[PDB]
Request: fold
Amino acid sequence: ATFEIVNRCSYTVWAAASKGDAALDAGGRQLNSGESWTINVEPGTNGGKIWARTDCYFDDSGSGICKTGDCGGLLRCKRFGRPPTTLAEFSLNQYGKDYIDISNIKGFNVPMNFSPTTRGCRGVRCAADIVGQCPAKLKAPGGGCNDACTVFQTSEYCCTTGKCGPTEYSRFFKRLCPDAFSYVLDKPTTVTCPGSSNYRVTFCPTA
Reply:
């Protein structure tokens, strides 16, 4: 499947693409405002994620640090990034279907639209100003709005017993972005697309 990752933000982002134990394609790249990066993701990829990282510094060897979404200090991500990170999540060619969603379960850093470029399903978007409206206890100094599991590490926010309800904090993310997951057991906002669809992830889609 091909994904075109487009940075419509007015600031630079460092895009990242991983399936948790391996890079997808090059795994990361700098995108200045307006730039597009086309990657290929192998069919059947399960549990892939794409996200943006902000305020990064990397040296010659592709080592350094980002204020949100850092993936162990590497330009080319092999592992998932540190919250807060708005996530585009996908599982491809799962019994003939592709499954996409956007999640705020690991917080929010940059607004995102995640849309097929082929026929047969609709996209999803979380474009609200979550960082500007973020509850004081969830604000991340680096920028971004953390989820409550990252901040407080309780069974209720992290849904560690597999039983948990919505919370004042998950309702905040849900009120601003109803089409994104707001906690682990939220009513799914997954979109089912034809198997082998192609996609565009756009950062700052309204910008």
